[PDB]
mmCIF file with all atom_site columns, C-alpha atoms in Angstrom:
data_model
loop_
_atom_site.group_PDB
_atom_site.id
_atom_site.type_symbol
_atom_site.label_atom_id
_atom_site.label_alt_id
_atom_site.label_comp_id
_atom_site.label_asym_id
_atom_site.label_entity_id
_atom_site.label_seq_id
_atom_site.pdbx_PDB_ins_code
_atom_site.Cartn_x
_atom_site.Cartn_y
_atom_site.Cartn_z
_atom_site.occupancy
_atom_site.B_iso_or_equiv
_atom_site.pdbx_formal_charge
_atom_site.auth_seq_id
_atom_site.auth_comp_id
_atom_site.auth_asym_id
_atom_site.auth_atom_id
_atom_site.pdbx_PDB_model_num
ATOM 1   C CA . UNK W 1 1  ? -75.325 69.957 21.355 1.00 36.02 ? 1  UNK W CA 1
ATOM 2   C CA . UNK W 1 2  ? -77.043 71.715 24.499 1.00 33.27 ? 2  UNK W CA 1
ATOM 3   C CA . UNK W 1 3  ? -79.285 74.649 24.114 1.00 35.84 ? 3  UNK W CA 1
ATOM 4   C CA . UNK W 1 4  ? -77.733 77.938 25.657 1.00 40.70 ? 4  UNK W CA 1
ATOM 5   C CA . UNK W 1 5  ? -80.752 80.215 24.300 1.00 37.03 ? 5  UNK W CA 1
ATOM 6   C CA . UNK W 1 6  ? -84.093 80.307 22.301 1.00 36.50 ? 6  UNK W CA 1
ATOM 7   C CA . UNK W 1 7  ? -84.779 82.136 19.268 1.00 35.62 ? 7  UNK W CA 1
ATOM 8   C CA . UNK W 1 8  ? -88.608 80.563 18.909 1.00 35.80 ? 8  UNK W CA 1
ATOM 9   C CA . UNK W 1 9  ? -90.127 77.240 18.561 1.00 30.29 ? 9  UNK W CA 1
ATOM 10  C CA . UNK W 1 10 ? -87.701 76.031 15.979 1.00 32.65 ? 10 UNK W CA 1
ATOM 11  C CA . UNK W 1 11 ? -84.347 78.194 16.038 1.00 33.21 ? 11 UNK W CA 1
ATOM 12  C CA . UNK W 1 12 ? -82.391 78.077 19.352 1.00 35.58 ? 12 UNK W CA 1
ATOM 13  C CA . UNK W 1 13 ? -79.047 79.211 20.034 1.00 35.64 ? 13 UNK W CA 1
ATOM 14  C CA . UNK W 1 14 ? -76.795 76.148 21.154 1.00 35.81 ? 14 UNK W CA 1
ATOM 15  C CA . UNK W 1 15 ? -72.991 75.751 21.886 1.00 30.69 ? 15 UNK W CA 1
ATOM 16  C CA . UNK W 1 16 ? -70.434 73.487 20.376 1.00 34.04 ? 16 UNK W CA 1
ATOM 17  C CA . UNK W 1 17 ? -66.768 72.394 20.987 1.00 32.45 ? 17 UNK W CA 1
ATOM 18  C CA . UNK W 1 18 ? -65.746 75.169 18.322 1.00 30.04 ? 18 UNK W CA 1
ATOM 19  C CA . UNK W 1 19 ? -67.958 77.950 19.701 1.00 31.21 ? 19 UNK W CA 1
ATOM 20  C CA . UNK W 1 20 ? -71.725 79.264 19.908 1.00 31.72 ? 20 UNK W CA 1
ATOM 21  C CA . UNK W 1 21 ? -73.892 77.771 17.302 1.00 29.48 ? 21 UNK W CA 1
ATOM 22  C CA . UNK W 1 22 ? -77.700 77.990 16.239 1.00 29.40 ? 22 UNK W CA 1
ATOM 23  C CA . UNK W 1 23 ? -80.130 75.025 15.508 1.00 29.71 ? 23 UNK W CA 1
ATOM 24  C CA . UNK W 1 24 ? -82.771 75.799 13.209 1.00 27.14 ? 24 UNK W CA 1
ATOM 25  C CA . UNK W 1 25 ? -85.278 72.780 13.198 1.00 28.41 ? 25 UNK W CA 1
ATOM 26  C CA . UNK W 1 26 ? -89.144 73.024 13.047 1.00 30.56 ? 26 UNK W CA 1
ATOM 27  C CA . UNK W 1 27 ? -90.473 72.074 16.549 1.00 30.74 ? 27 UNK W CA 1
ATOM 28  C CA . UNK W 1 28 ? -86.788 72.183 17.856 1.00 33.01 ? 28 UNK W CA 1
ATOM 29  C CA . UNK W 1 29 ? -88.005 74.161 20.833 1.00 32.55 ? 29 UNK W CA 1
ATOM 30  C CA . UNK W 1 30 ? -90.720 71.624 21.360 1.00 32.05 ? 30 UNK W CA 1
ATOM 31  C CA . UNK W 1 31 ? -89.682 68.527 22.998 1.00 31.80 ? 31 UNK W CA 1
ATOM 32  C CA . UNK W 1 32 ? -86.740 69.870 24.418 1.00 33.13 ? 32 UNK W CA 1
ATOM 33  C CA . UNK W 1 33 ? -85.717 72.985 26.946 1.00 31.85 ? 33 UNK W CA 1
ATOM 34  C CA . UNK W 1 34 ? -82.647 75.443 27.671 1.00 32.84 ? 34 UNK W CA 1
ATOM 35  C CA . UNK W 1 35 ? -79.515 73.331 28.647 1.00 34.92 ? 35 UNK W CA 1
ATOM 36  C CA . UNK W 1 36 ? -81.196 70.099 27.177 1.00 32.69 ? 36 UNK W CA 1
ATOM 37  C CA . UNK W 1 37 ? -79.512 68.189 24.505 1.00 33.40 ? 37 UNK W CA 1
ATOM 38  C CA . UNK W 1 38 ? -80.712 69.129 20.634 1.00 32.58 ? 38 UNK W CA 1
ATOM 39  C CA . UNK W 1 39 ? -83.124 66.329 19.088 1.00 31.32 ? 39 UNK W CA 1
ATOM 40  C CA . UNK W 1 40 ? -81.247 65.275 15.950 1.00 32.58 ? 40 UNK W CA 1
ATOM 41  C CA . UNK W 1 41 ? -84.605 64.146 14.388 1.00 32.02 ? 41 UNK W CA 1
ATOM 42  C CA . UNK W 1 42 ? -85.468 67.672 14.791 1.00 29.41 ? 42 UNK W CA 1
ATOM 43  C CA . UNK W 1 43 ? -82.022 69.260 13.439 1.00 32.50 ? 43 UNK W CA 1
ATOM 44  C CA . UNK W 1 44 ? -82.958 70.828 10.368 1.00 33.73 ? 44 UNK W CA 1
ATOM 45  C CA . UNK W 1 45 ? -80.125 73.528 9.865  1.00 34.88 ? 45 UNK W CA 1
ATOM 46  C CA . UNK W 1 46 ? -76.913 74.089 11.980 1.00 37.25 ? 46 UNK W CA 1
ATOM 47  C CA . UNK W 1 47 ? -75.507 77.578 11.776 1.00 33.93 ? 47 UNK W CA 1
ATOM 48  C CA . UNK W 1 48 ? -71.915 78.560 13.450 1.00 33.75 ? 48 UNK W CA 1
ATOM 49  C CA . UNK W 1 49 ? -70.520 82.136 14.032 1.00 32.57 ? 49 UNK W CA 1
ATOM 50  C CA . UNK W 1 50 ? -67.717 82.858 11.647 1.00 32.28 ? 50 UNK W CA 1
ATOM 51  C CA . UNK W 1 51 ? -64.766 82.367 14.114 1.00 34.08 ? 51 UNK W CA 1
ATOM 52  C CA . UNK W 1 52 ? -61.945 83.500 11.750 1.00 32.72 ? 52 UNK W CA 1
ATOM 53  C CA . UNK W 1 53 ? -61.760 84.249 7.842  1.00 33.70 ? 53 UNK W CA 1
ATOM 54  C CA . UNK W 1 54 ? -58.252 82.836 6.705  1.00 32.13 ? 54 UNK W CA 1
ATOM 55  C CA . UNK W 1 55 ? -56.082 82.948 9.880  1.00 31.98 ? 55 UNK W CA 1
ATOM 56  C CA . UNK M 2 1  ? -77.268 91.202 3.335  1.00 34.55 ? 1  UNK M CA 1
ATOM 57  C CA . UNK M 2 2  ? -80.644 90.490 2.719  1.00 36.75 ? 2  UNK M CA 1
ATOM 58  C CA . UNK M 2 3  ? -83.306 88.868 4.793  1.00 35.16 ? 3  UNK M CA 1
ATOM 59  C CA . UNK M 2 4  ? -84.419 85.392 3.520  1.00 35.61 ? 4  UNK M CA 1
ATOM 60  C CA . UNK M 2 5  ? -86.311 84.294 6.619  1.00 34.68 ? 5  UNK M CA 1
ATOM 61  C CA . UNK M 2 6  ? -87.742 85.739 9.917  1.00 29.64 ? 6  UNK M CA 1
ATOM 62  C CA . UNK M 2 7  ? -86.711 83.720 13.194 1.00 29.79 ? 7  UNK M CA 1
ATOM 63  C CA . UNK M 2 8  ? -88.084 86.337 15.805 1.00 31.53 ? 8  UNK M CA 1
ATOM 64  C CA . UNK M 2 9  ? -88.006 89.908 16.461 1.00 34.22 ? 9  UNK M CA 1
ATOM 65  C CA . UNK M 2 10 ? -83.994 89.789 16.674 1.00 37.40 ? 10 UNK M CA 1
ATOM 66  C CA . UNK M 2 11 ? -82.945 86.598 14.912 1.00 36.89 ? 11 UNK M CA 1
ATOM 67  C CA . UNK M 2 12 ? -83.438 86.340 10.942 1.00 39.78 ? 12 UNK M CA 1
ATOM 68  C CA . UNK M 2 13 ? -82.163 83.846 8.251  1.00 40.86 ? 13 UNK M CA 1
ATOM 69  C CA . UNK M 2 14 ? -80.148 86.036 5.788  1.00 40.66 ? 14 UNK M CA 1
ATOM 70  C CA . UNK M 2 15 ? -77.979 85.050 2.641  1.00 41.88 ? 15 UNK M CA 1
ATOM 71  C CA . UNK M 2 16 ? -74.501 86.047 1.627  1.00 42.00 ? 16 UNK M CA 1
ATOM 72  C CA . UNK M 2 17 ? -72.288 85.237 -1.013 1.00 43.88 ? 17 UNK M CA 1
ATOM 73  C CA . UNK M 2 18 ? -70.935 82.119 0.502  1.00 39.15 ? 18 UNK M CA 1
ATOM 74  C CA . UNK M 2 19 ? -74.440 80.539 1.580  1.00 39.02 ? 19 UNK M CA 1
ATOM 75  C CA . UNK M 2 20 ? -77.155 80.979 3.805  1.00 38.99 ? 20 UNK M CA 1
ATOM 76  C CA . UNK M 2 21 ? -76.419 83.004 7.091  1.00 37.26 ? 21 UNK M CA 1
ATOM 77  C CA . UNK M 2 22 ? -78.021 84.184 10.325 1.00 33.20 ? 22 UNK M CA 1
ATOM 78  C CA . UNK M 2 23 ? -78.679 87.650 11.620 1.00 34.32 ? 23 UNK M CA 1
ATOM 79  C CA . UNK M 2 24 ? -79.118 87.771 15.624 1.00 35.60 ? 24 UNK M CA 1
ATOM 80  C CA . UNK M 2 25 ? -79.517 91.218 16.718 1.00 35.68 ? 25 UNK M CA 1
ATOM 81  C CA . UNK M 2 26 ? -81.921 92.570 19.246 1.00 34.81 ? 26 UNK M CA 1
ATOM 82  C CA . UNK M 2 27 ? -84.638 94.639 17.381 1.00 33.12 ? 27 UNK M CA 1
ATOM 83  C CA . UNK M 2 28 ? -83.089 93.210 13.945 1.00 33.64 ? 28 UNK M CA 1
ATOM 84  C CA . UNK M 2 29 ? -86.600 92.417 12.752 1.00 36.62 ? 29 UNK M CA 1
ATOM 85  C CA . UNK M 2 30 ? -87.781 96.004 13.786 1.00 36.74 ? 30 UNK M CA 1
ATOM 86  C CA . UNK M 2 31 ? -86.638 98.655 11.484 1.00 35.69 ? 31 UNK M CA 1
ATOM 87  C CA . UNK M 2 32 ? -86.534 96.209 8.587  1.00 38.32 ? 32 UNK M CA 1
ATOM 88  C CA . UNK M 2 33 ? -88.503 93.488 6.519  1.00 36.80 ? 33 UNK M CA 1
ATOM 89  C CA . UNK M 2 34 ? -87.942 90.370 4.406  1.00 37.93 ? 34 UNK M CA 1
ATOM 90  C CA . UNK M 2 35 ? -85.630 91.016 1.465  1.00 35.03 ? 35 UNK M CA 1
ATOM 91  C CA . UNK M 2 36 ? -84.589 94.245 3.162  1.00 36.09 ? 36 UNK M CA 1
ATOM 92  C CA . UNK M 2 37 ? -80.933 94.714 3.751  1.00 36.82 ? 37 UNK M CA 1
ATOM 93  C CA . UNK M 2 38 ? -79.877 94.087 7.476  1.00 36.69 ? 38 UNK M CA 1
ATOM 94  C CA . UNK M 2 39 ? -78.994 97.047 9.750  1.00 36.10 ? 39 UNK M CA 1
ATOM 95  C CA . UNK M 2 40 ? -75.576 96.728 10.905 1.00 36.29 ? 40 UNK M CA 1
ATOM 96  C CA . UNK M 2 41 ? -76.104 98.723 13.889 1.00 35.03 ? 41 UNK M CA 1
ATOM 97  C CA . UNK M 2 42 ? -78.714 96.213 14.994 1.00 35.66 ? 42 UNK M CA 1
ATOM 98  C CA . UNK M 2 43 ? -76.093 93.271 13.808 1.00 35.39 ? 43 UNK M CA 1
ATOM 99  C CA . UNK M 2 44 ? -75.158 91.322 17.372 1.00 31.76 ? 44 UNK M CA 1
ATOM 100 C CA . UNK M 2 45 ? -74.225 88.118 15.999 1.00 31.40 ? 45 UNK M CA 1
ATOM 101 C CA . UNK M 2 46 ? -73.658 86.539 12.478 1.00 31.33 ? 46 UNK M CA 1
ATOM 102 C CA . UNK M 2 47 ? -73.850 82.932 12.022 1.00 31.08 ? 47 UNK M CA 1
ATOM 103 C CA . UNK M 2 48 ? -73.339 80.887 8.835  1.00 29.31 ? 48 UNK M CA 1
ATOM 104 C CA . UNK M 2 49 ? -74.094 77.073 8.270  1.00 29.20 ? 49 UNK M CA 1
ATOM 105 C CA . UNK M 2 50 ? -71.044 74.836 7.957  1.00 29.12 ? 50 UNK M CA 1
ATOM 106 C CA . UNK M 2 51 ? -70.427 74.559 4.456  1.00 26.97 ? 51 UNK M CA 1
ATOM 107 C CA . UNK M 2 52 ? -67.259 71.995 4.459  1.00 28.42 ? 52 UNK M CA 1
ATOM 108 C CA . UNK M 2 53 ? -64.956 70.683 7.357  1.00 29.93 ? 53 UNK M CA 1
ATOM 109 C CA . UNK M 2 54 ? -61.636 70.315 5.605  1.00 28.99 ? 54 UNK M CA 1
ATOM 110 C CA . UNK M 2 55 ? -62.388 69.936 1.932  1.00 28.39 ? 55 UNK M CA 1
#
């Protein structure tokens, strides 16, 4: 899980195999940087954009 | 779509019928507040936490 963007010191826009994701972790931005792998101990909430409804 | 949390001036943690969501919109925080409906013209990216994989 890399960091494609930065929302704040906890939320960041990441990207997974499926598509773009969002990593919300208190202090996630701290101890990491853009393009760096996301720290799993800091992973508090993983969000993914709705790709498809039923299809 | 209400605003349960605020990530920055564009990203905010919202909540839909399915579960918690994330609204990433440049200026989304501006022209709105916590618990207020999210402006659709500002909606740039909607993210939802992975509820279930296959089940």
